[PDB]
Write a protein that holds these residues in place. Structure first.
Motif, PDB file in Angstrom:
ATOM      1  N   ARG A  87       4.718   5.591  -0.692  1.00  0.00           N
ATOM      2  CA  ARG A  87       3.606   4.813  -0.349  1.00  0.00           C
ATOM      3  C   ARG A  87       3.773   3.461  -0.851  1.00  0.00           C
ATOM      4  O   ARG A  87       3.130   2.420  -0.198  1.00  0.00           O
ATOM      5  CB  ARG A  87       2.493   5.324  -1.485  1.00  0.00           C
ATOM      6  CG  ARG A  87       1.915   6.806  -0.929  1.00  0.00           C
ATOM      7  CD  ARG A  87       1.259   7.437  -2.044  1.00  0.00           C
ATOM      8  NE  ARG A  87       0.048   6.492  -2.751  1.00  0.00           N
ATOM      9  CZ  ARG A  87      -1.018   6.207  -2.431  1.00  0.00           C
ATOM     10  NH1 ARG A  87      -1.814   7.066  -1.288  1.00  0.00           N
ATOM     11  NH2 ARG A  87      -1.895   5.415  -3.013  1.00  0.00           N
ATOM     12  N   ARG A 100       1.702  -0.861 -10.686  1.00  0.00           N
ATOM     13  CA  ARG A 100       1.422   0.363  -9.970  1.00  0.00           C
ATOM     14  C   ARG A 100       2.573   1.143  -9.947  1.00  0.00           C
ATOM     15  O   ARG A 100       2.437   2.473 -10.465  1.00  0.00           O
ATOM     16  CB  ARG A 100       0.796   0.219  -8.517  1.00  0.00           C
ATOM     17  CG  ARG A 100      -0.572  -0.661  -8.668  1.00  0.00           C
ATOM     18  CD  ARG A 100      -0.975  -0.806  -6.906  1.00  0.00           C
ATOM     19  NE  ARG A 100      -2.341  -1.516  -7.070  1.00  0.00           N
ATOM     20  CZ  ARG A 100      -3.579  -0.769  -6.573  1.00  0.00           C
ATOM     21  NH1 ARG A 100      -3.491   0.474  -6.283  1.00  0.00           N
ATOM     22  NH2 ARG A 100      -4.534  -1.504  -6.689  1.00  0.00           N
ATOM     23  N   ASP A 121       3.202   4.895 -12.079  1.00  0.00           N
ATOM     24  CA  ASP A 121       3.241   6.170 -11.683  1.00  0.00           C
ATOM     25  C   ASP A 121       4.711   6.644 -12.164  1.00  0.00           C
ATOM     26  O   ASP A 121       4.655   7.925 -12.122  1.00  0.00           O
ATOM     27  CB  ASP A 121       3.679   5.893  -9.915  1.00  0.00           C
ATOM     28  CG  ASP A 121       2.339   5.858  -9.323  1.00  0.00           C
ATOM     29  OD1 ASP A 121       1.454   6.584  -9.672  1.00  0.00           O
ATOM     30  OD2 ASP A 121       2.138   5.490  -8.031  1.00  0.00           O
ATOM     31  N   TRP A 159      -4.611  -4.156  -1.548  1.00  0.00           N
ATOM     32  CA  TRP A 159      -5.479  -3.883  -2.425  1.00  0.00           C
ATOM     33  C   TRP A 159      -6.586  -4.737  -2.641  1.00  0.00           C
ATOM     34  O   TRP A 159      -6.777  -5.706  -1.923  1.00  0.00           O
ATOM     35  CB  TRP A 159      -4.584  -3.979  -4.022  1.00  0.00           C
ATOM     36  CG  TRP A 159      -3.219  -3.190  -3.732  1.00  0.00           C
ATOM     37  CD1 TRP A 159      -3.054  -1.884  -3.673  1.00  0.00           C
ATOM     38  CD2 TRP A 159      -2.070  -3.815  -3.897  1.00  0.00           C
ATOM     39  NE1 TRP A 159      -1.815  -1.618  -3.620  1.00  0.00           N
ATOM     40  CE2 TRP A 159      -0.950  -2.744  -3.882  1.00  0.00           C
ATOM     41  CE3 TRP A 159      -1.509  -5.014  -3.831  1.00  0.00           C
ATOM     42  CZ2 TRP A 159       0.304  -2.797  -3.914  1.00  0.00           C
ATOM     43  CZ3 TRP A 159      -0.244  -5.444  -4.092  1.00  0.00           C
ATOM     44  CH2 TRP A 159       0.862  -4.156  -3.891  1.00  0.00           C
ATOM     45  N   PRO A 197      -4.175  11.285  -2.888  1.00  0.00           N
ATOM     46  CA  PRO A 197      -4.770  10.125  -2.405  1.00  0.00           C
ATOM     47  C   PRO A 197      -4.397  10.057  -1.037  1.00  0.00           C
ATOM     48  O   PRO A 197      -3.078  10.312  -0.514  1.00  0.00           O
ATOM     49  CB  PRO A 197      -3.864   9.308  -3.427  1.00  0.00           C
ATOM     50  CG  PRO A 197      -2.332  10.025  -3.692  1.00  0.00           C
ATOM     51  CD  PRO A 197      -3.135  11.386  -3.814  1.00  0.00           C
ATOM     52  N   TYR A 240      -3.440   7.327   1.544  1.00  0.00           N
ATOM     53  CA  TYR A 240      -2.839   6.142   1.755  1.00  0.00           C
ATOM     54  C   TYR A 240      -3.634   5.367   2.892  1.00  0.00           C
ATOM     55  O   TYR A 240      -4.293   5.976   3.808  1.00  0.00           O
ATOM     56  CB  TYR A 240      -1.535   6.229   2.593  1.00  0.00           C
ATOM     57  CG  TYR A 240      -1.009   4.864   2.766  1.00  0.00           C
ATOM     58  CD1 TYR A 240      -0.985   4.464   3.976  1.00  0.00           C
ATOM     59  CD2 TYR A 240      -0.011   3.992   1.667  1.00  0.00           C
ATOM     60  CE1 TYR A 240      -0.350   3.304   4.386  1.00  0.00           C
ATOM     61  CE2 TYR A 240       0.530   3.033   2.321  1.00  0.00           C
ATOM     62  CZ  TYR A 240       0.339   2.570   3.525  1.00  0.00           C
ATOM     63  OH  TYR A 240       0.914   1.256   3.843  1.00  0.00           O
ATOM     64  N   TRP A 271      -4.987   3.978   0.189  1.00  0.00           N
ATOM     65  CA  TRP A 271      -5.764   4.066  -1.174  1.00  0.00           C
ATOM     66  C   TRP A 271      -5.440   5.006  -1.981  1.00  0.00           C
ATOM     67  O   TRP A 271      -4.491   5.786  -1.716  1.00  0.00           O
ATOM     68  CB  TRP A 271      -7.189   3.893  -0.868  1.00  0.00           C
ATOM     69  CG  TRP A 271      -7.703   2.986   0.391  1.00  0.00           C
ATOM     70  CD1 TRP A 271      -7.787   1.729   0.348  1.00  0.00           C
ATOM     71  CD2 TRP A 271      -8.373   3.354   1.695  1.00  0.00           C
ATOM     72  NE1 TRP A 271      -8.232   1.361   1.441  1.00  0.00           N
ATOM     73  CE2 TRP A 271      -8.580   2.198   2.308  1.00  0.00           C
ATOM     74  CE3 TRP A 271      -8.420   4.699   2.078  1.00  0.00           C
ATOM     75  CZ2 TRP A 271      -8.891   2.385   3.479  1.00  0.00           C
ATOM     76  CZ3 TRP A 271      -8.712   4.905   3.484  1.00  0.00           C
ATOM     77  CH2 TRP A 271      -9.096   3.837   3.996  1.00  0.00           C
ATOM     78  N   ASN A 272      -6.005   4.932  -3.222  1.00  0.00           N
ATOM     79  CA  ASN A 272      -5.873   5.938  -4.237  1.00  0.00           C
ATOM     80  C   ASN A 272      -6.993   7.092  -4.067  1.00  0.00           C
ATOM     81  O   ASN A 272      -7.185   8.224  -4.815  1.00  0.00           O
ATOM     82  CB  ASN A 272      -5.973   5.560  -5.619  1.00  0.00           C
ATOM     83  CG  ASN A 272      -4.685   4.733  -6.001  1.00  0.00           C
ATOM     84  OD1 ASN A 272      -3.490   4.869  -5.497  1.00  0.00           O
ATOM     85  ND2 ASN A 272      -5.022   3.653  -6.769  1.00  0.00           N
ATOM     86  N   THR A 284      -9.441   9.939  -2.817  1.00  0.00           N
ATOM     87  CA  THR A 284      -9.149  11.534  -2.478  1.00  0.00           C
ATOM     88  C   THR A 284     -10.181  12.072  -1.494  1.00  0.00           C
ATOM     89  O   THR A 284     -11.222  11.353  -1.777  1.00  0.00           O
ATOM     90  CB  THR A 284      -8.939  12.135  -3.516  1.00  0.00           C
ATOM     91  OG1 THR A 284     -10.141  12.548  -4.406  1.00  0.00           O
ATOM     92  CG2 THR A 284      -8.060  11.615  -4.777  1.00  0.00           C
TER      93      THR A 284
END
Ligand SMILES: Oc1ccc(O)cc1
Ligand SMILES: Oc1ccc(O)cc1
Ligand SMILES: [Zn+2]
Ligand SMILES: [Zn+2]
Ligand SMILES: [Zn+2]
Ligand SMILES: [Zn+2]
Lengths: 287, 287
Positions: free
Chosen positions: A34, A72, A76, A266, B262, B264, B266-267, B269
């Protein structure tokens, strides 16, 4: 102010092992890819279309974009091991060696060594060698390994020096119009490395070679994050030195480049990441 | 529940003008291009790399990805005019016309007409005609206009019909293994349009032609969001009919496709968007 980012050379053997293993886990789960794609996508997002600025490079957003990128990524890392933080590769010092390729960062227990010319400069040592670490190409398809080729270019035979970093820190303005490749007397542009390029950040990318040498594939090499942790540290030092200076542009720049514009891909704005301590981390030299 | 999304044919003249105005503002500000790039980036993000699944298509995440896509887009519309919602193009009734190109959605006050063959199928009518609406190519660079070519393909000469939508709503399982193009007895794959393709969603894309016919460029046409608002409405209807069916896969699918993975870039779901009413909107047929 709690999360301490350390110099790669100051890491213990167990700290090097834990970071490597964490990155491998983040890769196996599918999370690491990602970050490759985000960086590649932002490189294709021009602000505005027609210009050669993109969301992550060649424009004022270069520094805050990568600070958010590393933030970010570090979160993670912690989600796997809450005691792992992002180290930084202080390449300025490494440039003092007559042969920087012998730096401990390139040891088999950390990043691994240079590419093997017999195998078309495939990395065959270290945890990310071919067979243990799959890479993806510009199109998002497998590409068969991590490549490096230290200092094989005529445009970037050496790593940036301490003096190069010192001369960038002397710049007063964060950035200048037209907020792009051509910005003069601009700390952002200087650090990025387009002032008589390739210098500093750009020069490190081209010195490593392989995937690191080209924008759409650079994060395939885990040293990308170590490199940009040092870039982020140099920025944080510049912010401490120049207390009367702030991000530029504040307004009337291209959309995606202003202080309160969202940075593709983002919603994060440069303002959101302007104070790195507010983001919950610090560099070891700050203590 | 608060935001009601109306059939395009049920919009007043002032509702059509306000939507067009909003989209143009979102375009001028630089926000619209973020949706073009997001959609293109997800098309390049394969789950896993090597397969022909991607984060936004050809897999189970197709429906929740675009619901989140439209949700973010509608919020950006509201940011400009809090009374503007995203209408839906009910193409299954337009397919009842002997010439669907005469539908009011293609009027000069809304989406504009078909491409002009004298001008290599450039759209020269409506608010998004060439000279009033710039497009970008797969690489993120300007591309010189919006192109359309209704039903010019041998694989999609007509719009999907109503019975087509009814037969998709009969499917019991949301999706089936191996969660890709080849999924049989799968509402997701049928809706998307790979069952004897191109059908439904895929067929509409290929029927419009131009940018809409091509994955990396389709959102250059504002009708992309009208098209997928109808796809999202059909999905919401299927969820009401099969109230005790849920998203699939729940686990052990490719990463990025599971209920809580998530999506992609974005996060977000799939679970986050499984209840469209919880997201703050409804379709007019629900009233
Ligand atoms: O992705 C990259 C961006 C900038 C560089 O100088 C090299 C790679
Ligand atoms: O994500 C997309 C799917 C189908 C298209 O025709 C274009 C984009
Ligand atoms: Zn880069
Ligand atoms: Zn870089
Ligand atoms: Zn009607
Ligand atoms: Zn689509």
């Amino acid at each position: 102010k709690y999360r301490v980012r350390k110099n790669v050379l100051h890491l213990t053997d167990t700290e090097k092992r834990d970071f490597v293993r964490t990155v491998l886990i983040l890769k196996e789960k599918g999370i690491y890819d990602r970050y490759i794609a985000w960086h590649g996508a932002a490189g294709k997002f021009h602000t505005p279309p027609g210009s050669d600025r993109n969301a992550a490079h060649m424009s004022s957003a270069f520094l805050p974009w990568h600070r958010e990128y590393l933030l970010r990524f570090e979160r993670d890392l912690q989600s796997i091991n809450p005691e792992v933080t992002l180290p930084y590769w202080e390449w300025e010092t490494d440039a003092q060696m007559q042969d920087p390729s012998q730096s401990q960062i390139w040891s088999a227990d950390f990043m691994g060594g240079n590419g093997n010319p017999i195998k078309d400069f495939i990395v065959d040592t270290g945890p990310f060698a071919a067979g243990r670490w799959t890479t993806i190409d510009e199109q998002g398809n497998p590409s068969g390994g991590l490549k490096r080729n230290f200092g094989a270019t005529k445009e970037a035979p050496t790593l940036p020096t301490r003096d190069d970093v010192l001369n960038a820190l002397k710049i007063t303005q964060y950035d200048t119009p037209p907020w792009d490749m051509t910005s003069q007397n601009s700390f952002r542009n200087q650090l990025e490395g387009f002032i008589n390029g390739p210098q500093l950040h750009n020069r490190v990318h081209r010195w490593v070679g392989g995937q690191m040498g080209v924008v759409p594939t650079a994060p395939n090499d885990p040293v990308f994050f170590l490199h940009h942790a040092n870039v982020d540290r140099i920025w944080a030092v510049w912010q401490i030195i120049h207390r009367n200076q702030n991000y530029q542009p504040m307004k009337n720049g291209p959309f995606g480049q202003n202080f309160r514009d969202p940075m593709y891909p983002w919603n994060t704005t440069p303002e959101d990441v302007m104070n790195h301590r507010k983001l919950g981390y610090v560099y070891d030299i700050e203590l």
